[PDB]
């Protein structure tokens, strides 16, 4: 044999070793060809949906989602006892490669071992190809190890005007890159070292941004309490007062909450929503080169005010979906909606205004006038939390290679990397297909929980009530399932 079967996790000090071994089956895509693809074939009825690009015969491996590397238990173990984590090393092995050739005479096909076939598999470490991993697409290794999966088909999109290309478009030939070729006695391994990244914050702040103050003392600062003495003409006056625990709205604070871009508000009780088709017109959306595009998920913002759980920001959520969910027009309870509310202390709510500002200058003939600030970007002195990472969410994304950026952490959450884990492309050699094994390993560094807090934490736990099936487990028919999206913010720190 060309490799062994390793799946497990080792817990050593601050380190976690995540070992997954999966079994893949790769067919031949595009009948061994490259193909133009565009909107007009599929019908291209939108200027926002207009695209041009090429689908290539190759497949690729994608482990970029968490449920690959962490069993639901080891996720629970990690979340409850840690204040942060991040990847250190990467180790990937390809082995036990097989190539089956297909012969179908009339009704029934016969599949037999072809021993001399080769498999072409290379890794692009210079990021010369288009890199599609940071887009949260399907095709990643199945959460549950016994399941066998179909390796995705690679493809890419280059620049376009409508469906038509432009002279600055590009065409990348995956045959142009030197690629080791593997037979049933060959095995391909490489390793990778993660670049410096900040520990993911996996805690909920105990205190909010505006309650940082001491409740027992006054401030020495003063504020303007009264602009008139009473009812009548000529009451203009200036009165002042100490900012104190009596009125805490006004106390001078060092820090202020982060950015906001307002999302429309949708209720999960369908009769509180307006009787109109506001799904597309209503939603926030950013425009690029004349193409409109939705704002999704957007800046990291609390999902709803405290105490209001039937509301979710229209486009501003990560909405996963339950096992078995249909592709199109599925009912609202077929999907799972994540909520970021744990950040609501530091970050504004997505469906509310960040604040107000004063429009005019008051006089005897003018009232002080204010207006709603809908979208407020970074100002010096802001603090915020990023979006959480979930068992079902992405791990990393590639930071676009550009003049500059601010807070490179990706807006769907996870660890942004300029040199993320490289893409691994594979194909059959030019009716035949391959099957083989994959063992990927990551080494994670942990941040241990330091708290002196007296009273016990919120922990993640499996609820205690009899049910037909154990959660995070197979049903009777064999289909694995993930009942709900498990974020990591449970323990607590001071602000």
């Amino acid at each position, epitope marked *: 044999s060309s490799g062994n079967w390793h799946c497990d996790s080792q817990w050593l000090g601050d380190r976690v070793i995540t070992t997954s071994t999966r079994t893949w089956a790769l067919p031949t895509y595009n009948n061994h060809l490259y193909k133009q693809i565009s909107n007009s074939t599929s019908g291209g009825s939108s200027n926002d949906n207009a695209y041009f690009g090429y689908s290539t015969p190759w497949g690729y491996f994608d482990f970029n989602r968490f449920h690959c590397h962490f069993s639901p238990r080891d996720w629970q173990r990690l979340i409850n006892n840690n204040w942060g984590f991040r990847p250190k090393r990467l180790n990937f092995k390809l082995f036990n490669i097989q190539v089956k050739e297909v012969t179908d005479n009339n009704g029934v096909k016969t599949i037999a071992n072809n021993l001399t076939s080769t498999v072409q598999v290379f890794t692009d470490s210079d990021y010369q190809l288009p890199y599609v991993l940071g887009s949260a697409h399907e095709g990643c290794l199945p959460p549950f190890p016994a399941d066998v999966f179909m390796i995705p088909q690679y493809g890419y999109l280059t620049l376009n005007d409508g469906s038509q290309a432009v002279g600055r478009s590009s065409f990348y030939c995956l045959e142009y890159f030197p690629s080791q070729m593997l037979r049933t006695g060959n095995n391909f391994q490489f390793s990778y070292e993660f670049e410096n990244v900040p520990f993911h914050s996996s805690y909920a702040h105990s205190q909010s941004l505006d309650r940082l103050m001491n409740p027992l003392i006054d401030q020495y600062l003063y504020y303007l309490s009264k602009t008139i003495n009473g009812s009548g003409q000529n009451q203009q006056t200036l009165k002042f007062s100490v900012a104190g625990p009596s009125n805490m709205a006004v106390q001078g604070r060092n820090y202020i909450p982060g950015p906001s871009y307002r999302q429309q508000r949708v209720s999960t009780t369908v*009769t509180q929503n307006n009787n109109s088709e506001f799904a597309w017109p209503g939603a926030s959306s950013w425009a690029l080169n004349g193409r409109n595009s939705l704002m999704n998920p957007g800046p990291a913002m609390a999902s*709803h005010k405290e*105490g209001e759980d039937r509301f979710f920001p229209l486009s501003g959520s990560l909405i996963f979906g339950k096992q078995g969910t249909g592709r199109d027009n599925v*009912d609202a309870d077929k999907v799972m909606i994540t*909520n970021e*509310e744990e950040i609501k202390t530091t970050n504004p709510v997505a469906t509310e205004s960040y604040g107000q500002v004063a429009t005019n200058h008051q006089s005897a003939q003018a009232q002080a006038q204010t207006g709603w600030v809908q979208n407020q970007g970074i100002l010096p002195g802001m603090v915020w939390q990023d979006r959480d990472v979930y068992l079902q969410g992405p791990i990393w994304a590639k930071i676009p290679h550009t003049d500059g950026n601010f807070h490179p952490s990706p807006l769907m959450g996870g660890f942004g990397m300029k040199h993320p884990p490289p893409q691994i492309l594979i194909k059959n050699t030019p009716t035949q297909y391959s099957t083989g094994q994959v063992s990927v390993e990551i080494e994670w560094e942990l941040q241990k929980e330091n708290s002196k807090r007296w009273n016990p934490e919120i922990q993640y736990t499996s609820n205690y*009530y009899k049910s037909n099936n154990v959660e995070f487990a197979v049903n009777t028919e064999g289909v694995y399932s993930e009942p709900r999206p498990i974020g990591t913010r449970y323990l607590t720190r001071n602000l």
Partner: antibody, heavy 126, light 108 residues
């Protein structure tokens, strides 16, 4: 040790008014919803109204709708149902009940009513 | 509302099943149902929440099922304690709950 006990009221005249109050003891009252359901003497349960923990959502099944209000005081652990323009169509044992909760994070809902009040009889008769 | 029989009877030892039928907004579409036993002059006690889920206090013999556009309570191993009136509860499309006429169980 979870105890929902409501005082409420007895016999009252048609067209009159009544105020039912409930007392939650042994469990955290501010998290749960609360329901008012009624069982007419010979007939099955009917759900009059529910109130959210924060009080943001208060919805009435439409028989009453418009003639009752619902209120809850979280520091006082007490749910209130005040009713006006009573009819004979409203004579029932009124229950103070709460819906299932499991103490988790937001966007988690459970459908069923965990604990029930022992009831108060309301007789609206001319 | 939810339509369920007026009454059901069974002999001790044998499992029997009550059903409550509803519109696609009440049950057919949404998976919300729940079941309650009640004894005369006692506050109802929850048996089954969601469809098949059951609370810790409640006994084994009570299970639940949804065959679609319908929901059913299957009691096993009838005893004298099991005599009670069983109710069907399902939150609707508008998130306002509805019940059904109640069904008395008479153990012979």
């Amino acid at each position: 040790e979870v105890q929902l006990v409501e005082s409420g009221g007895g016999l009252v005249q048609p067209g009159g008014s009544l105020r039912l109050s409930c007392s939650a003891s042994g469990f955290h009252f501010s998290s749960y919803e609360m329901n008012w359901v009624r069982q007419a003497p010979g007939k099955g349960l009917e759900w009059v109204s529910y109130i959210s923990s924060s009080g943001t959502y208060i919805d009435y099944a439409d028989s009453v709708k418009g003639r009752f209000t619902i209120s809850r005081d979280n520091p006082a652990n007490s749910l209130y149902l005040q009713m006006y323009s009573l009819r004979a169509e409203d004579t029932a044992v009124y229950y103070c009940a709460r819906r299932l909760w499991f103490g988790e994070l937001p966007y988690s809902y459970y459908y069923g009513m965990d604990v029930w009040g022992q009831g108060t009889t309301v007789t609206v008769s001319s | 509302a939810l339509t369920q029989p007026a009454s059901v009877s069974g002999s001790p030892g044998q499992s029997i099943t009550i059903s409550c039928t509803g519109t696609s907004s009440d049950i057919g579409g949404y998976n919300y149902v729940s079941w309650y036993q009640q004894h005369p002059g006692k506050a109802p006690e929850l048996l089954i929440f969601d469809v098949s889920n059951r609370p810790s206090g409640v006994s084994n013999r009570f299970s639940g099922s949804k065959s679609g556009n319908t929901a059913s309570l299957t009691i096993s191993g009838l005893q004298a304690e099991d005599e009670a009136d069983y109710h069907c509860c399902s939150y609707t499309r508008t998130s306002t709950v509805i019940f059904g006429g109640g069904t008395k169980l008479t153990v012979l």
